């Protein structure tokens, strides 16, 4: 899937053997973690003007790509609790068709390239593109890289669960 | 436009002279204010199980109806500052394709039938159905009815502006 | 229009080329600002015993004069945000037939002749004579003259909007 | 199973396709969520005098019905973390034969029909009827309906796990 | 118009279709937003030593170019309230011939390339080159890019209003 | 496997049906819980001088024995949330080859034989022998025995998950 604006040009191809090359080494690493714990190969390429636009538009495109790949009847709910050294991060997803993100982190030891702004904009992008409810809740930790990487690992693991096929439409209201 | 779940059954028809009859007298009043200040006739009918499901699903259906009704090129931005006796409420809308709501109110004198829960759920529904950014920011006020009605009046006025036809795609990124 | 008591004798004639001469140089200046931003010539003359009675009775007479000049179907709502150097003042008017004034200012650097008492009594007079809801909300500023003059400039601009002719009775209740 | 007092008359039949009709529309909705996420059809009918007696006695009767339905050797432990928009609620169950409930919620935006009293009394009833340890721990959230519905969804999911057949008596002390 | 010092060399040509290329990608994006919402084509090119000198001198030069472009009699006042996701920013301009800037923002989630220092210096440069009073007041928000971009969008929209032709000298003192 | 120092002499044999007999009745009970929820038979015998050296060295030896027992490719991650009456304890494990323990508990009602010192030293021993990251985070609770026992139950359950065979090396860096 390709999404192109005047700001960014992004390809996300889920289930395809390929490199993740966004021209942002931090995001390449985070997306590698996400794909690995999701349990899917993917090819991702991007060009961009500003890193915010990249992280957001990657979130949106990835979310749309996951939505396109979603079985007609899907599990809907998935969670992960991801430790990474000092970090302990809860990730909870509901593929609800109600875009919402709540990212609650507390970075004590900052690291160049890792920013809460960028994390939040990726997650809101993902929530909007997938049309999902996403909570990221830090339970412990100080290190920026461990916290953010735990969040991406957790997103991958939670979405592994939530995107599996189900026998039914997973809502009491009869529609998702 | 009709939206039907096991919880609610809603029809919203913009531009048709008709009744607003939701079987919730508070919501009927608030929607009447909204339609009046938007400057458009509309017919709205609904059945529901619980009031929260009604307020939310009315927001969603109304938002989708407004989105369907938009000119290809639209003004995108609209604001209103709405006084109502003690209440003074700022409503700011960006038809951004990025669902978001922030409803920041402070009700001192409560009134039966008016609930922040219901206002928030309508606004989030509208933000999700229209695919828009919506801020409701109370500047002054105490009375629940004045605050909530000012918000609905302000939403009508802000959307009156934001849904008008434009000569261009109103985004520097070239797409909405 | 003339209003005469044992305390004051006031003439306000809107749409007439003339001087504003109240025998209070501060009020003459504030009224000049008001008329200029309203976009109307006016003639105003007054005699008075005490400045409070002047500012109040000018408010009342001006409000009655605006009410007499109001089209049968009028726009009802008008706002202004007026910067003046350090001052930034929001003025929001609803010609509601529900007299109410809320003047929320915070003068740090006082100036002879400018008093919150006098401002409040003018505004309450205006609200009572016009039969309107009036909010003045200081958003920024320290200087008494800039804050009060911004309020009068803003009143003029807000009433310019609110006193324009409309195609309809601007109330969902069918009466104003 | 039928439980009858001078206050309430309740039938709960697990595994029968049937209606959930308690004459309380909120509880009907919450029980529908519970049964849906438990993954079991059930028929529930009730009459009652006061809502508290209904919520409590429904908990008791449902708990007894679940206890009667358990395989001799059961999994005992089950958890769910349930997001619902702003709400994020942890539900942790141990079918311990030691009745206990701790419901730790924080409702900011109240909603008519939803009460912490009623939630607590249902959960304590369920803990006493099933003979179980039940924690409901709010991690995030403001909305009453989202919080309470997340708790019922989470209870269904947690009990789905805890009520599954096991190869052994799940206790180091050799008895449950 | 061209402005050259030992620090910077800047060309701003309002009304010419052309590139905005300052050798600062963040400023290019912000000026693109500014020009788009002002509603005028412009060509802007720059070289510079240090980003602060660029942002400031661009503000000065753009301000001078706008001043040169004004009709003899101009509207003087303009406002915008600009939402951008979480951000909600008020921009209020008075082309007063009294240089003044007050930039009141609160960035919670910082982003590389975006700095309050640079925003303030651009706005002070603009106020000084145009000879204007400029308030930027954040009402809501956390994200640096959303806040700063909302300010530039808002400046564009406010100056669109303020730079229009008027029938009169817009001052009670008879000169601007 | 056997580990002998001048302080302790410990045998841990995973997969062998046998006694857990450490000459510390509290540790015997905790290890019984651990083994039961891990789902593996084991024989553990020990002699010791001081209880701290026992708890630590048991942790080390058990960790080494688990490490020796791992398949070449293992699941790596495992979590448990364990209620025990008032206690609710999160246990999160990553068999990371990066020894780390964070035991975050809050015992209100102390009990003879149970000490935070001993729990921490067991967990650090285990993290160091297995070469793993281990978080024990109390979410609720007062009673020492319930809290500590929930931690051991949870460690068993979490390691049941983490020690299973995987089809791949579970790390984006390609080595563990
Ligand atoms: O989570 P869902 O949509 O499956 C069912 C809910 O009952 C719908 N809802 C949304 N807000 C309150 N209720
Ligand atoms: O508001 P838009 O989408 O027209 C242009 C913005 O540049 C896009 N954006 C979204 N977050 C940061 N920038
Ligand atoms: O503002 P109005 O009078 O047009 C209509 C309102 O519904 C009347 N009202 C006055 N208080 C509460 N409602
Ligand atoms: O949780 P159980 O009943 O399987 C075993 C526990 O050892 C019993 N216990 C209850 N309080 C303290 N210990
Ligand atoms: O805003 P202006 O210059 O049009 C007229 C003001 O009265 C001048 N002024 C400046 N400070 C106080 N008053
Ligand atoms: O958790 P791992 O070792 O599988 C991969 C991580 O990227 C390595 N890392 C360790 N600290 C920061 N990153
Ligand atoms: Mn963004
Ligand atoms: Mn890493
Ligand atoms: Mn809802
Ligand atoms: Mn009303
Ligand atoms: Mn008085
Ligand atoms: Mn003056
Ligand atoms: Mn009771
Ligand atoms: Mn519901
Ligand atoms: Mn400078
Ligand atoms: Mn941008
Ligand atoms: Mn030690
Ligand atoms: Mn015990």
Residue numbers in the entry:
A (entry chain C), B (entry chain A), C (entry chain C), D (entry chain A), E (entry chain B), F (entry chain B): 1 to 176
What does the report in the manuscript say about this coordinate set?
Significantly, the mirror‐image packing of the two enantiomers of C348 in IGPD2 gives rise to equipotency and, as in d/l‐AOPP superinhibitors of phenylalanine ammonia‐lyase, the mimicry of a reaction intermediate gives rise to potent inhibition. This study adds to the ever‐growing body of evidence that certain enzymes are chirally promiscuous and that mirror‐image packing of ligands is a more common feature than is generally recognized in the field of drug development.
The program of herbicide development described herein aims to identify inhibitors of imidazoleglycerolphosphate‐dehydratase (IGPD; EC 4.2.1.19), an enzyme of histidine biosynthesis in plants and microorganisms. In this paper we describe work on the lead compound, 2‐hydroxy‐3‐(1,2,4‐triazol‐1‐yl) propylphosphonate (C348) and present a series of structures of IGPD, from Arabidopsis thaliana, complexed with a synthetic racemate of C348 and with the enantiopure compounds.
